[model samples]
Target: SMEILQVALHKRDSGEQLGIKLVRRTDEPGVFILDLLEGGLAAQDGRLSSNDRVLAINGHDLKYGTPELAAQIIQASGERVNLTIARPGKPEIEL
Candidate 1:
């Protein structure tokens, strides 16, 4: 089935190691959709949840919030990601 792949990217440990944080503007994390990819950005790390705001990436902040920035992070890190989505209360499963 065709699905919406909402993707977001973050630094390796900009939040865990450093004190930096990406403030959540919306009720949920800021992310976008993709069709070619099977999943979103949550597949990279377990910590980066769907509702979790994507703060910094590779020690760089998400001031220029955009999925293109996420692409750059993936290129810089040499890693890709997938995402599993769910309803507000249901436990999300990986896609």
Candidate 2:
């Protein structure tokens, strides 16, 4: 394989370990991310990425995910969206 499993695991771990609730990244056609979490006996989790192909929402297909589709999954999201998505494969993320 392409070691996608290990890479995905690493990404997941690093992403989930972030203390901040918001996490975003611009890749491929540019993508954004955010985490769903809760406190006080209730915790949530889901990683969002524009390129991840939002197959479904709340166990429902993207078609029925109305408000979300309107607010989040938009065509131009990976493009304009008033946000500057950096050019991929270039120097941006400083390790």
Candidate 3:
């Protein structure tokens, strides 16, 4: 099964601290969440999960995106980020 999800992670009052770590999928050309920092903004939001495939950042599509640009887009976002995600498996998920 496959699923897509549109989620938003916002920065904290202390400053932008959406806690998510992304890594390129060695098996494919997309980025995947490798870590969810404990007690961080993302961890608290609880929408993003480990291994969730990132298809876009801040509305910029990453299906054919370069990893560097993806990083730039995410980093450039001041506070909130809209992400398109995909998770494939028997469990199913998406962006």
Which model scores highest in lDDT?
3
Clashing pairs in 1: 11-57, 11-58, 40-83
Candidates 2 and 3 compared: the better one by TM-score is 3
Which residue segments of model 2 deviate by more than 4 Å?
1-33, 38-53, 63-67, 70-95
Q: Pick the candidate with the highest TM-score.
A: 3
Ranking by lDDT: 3, 1, 2
Alpha-carbon RMSD, candidate 3: 4.5
Model 3, poorest ten-residue lDDT window? 10-19
lDDT of 1 at 59: 49
**Cα lDDT of model 3 overall?**
0.78
Candidates in order, TM-scores: namely 0.35, 0.20, 0.80
Tens digit of per-residue lDDT, candidate 1, span 1-95: 32322343444542322112223345545542222222423443333333343444554555346566655554556232333332233365777
Candidate 3 ranges beyond 4 A from true positions: 13-15, 92-95
lDDT of all predictions, in order shown?
Answer: 0.39, 0.27, 0.78
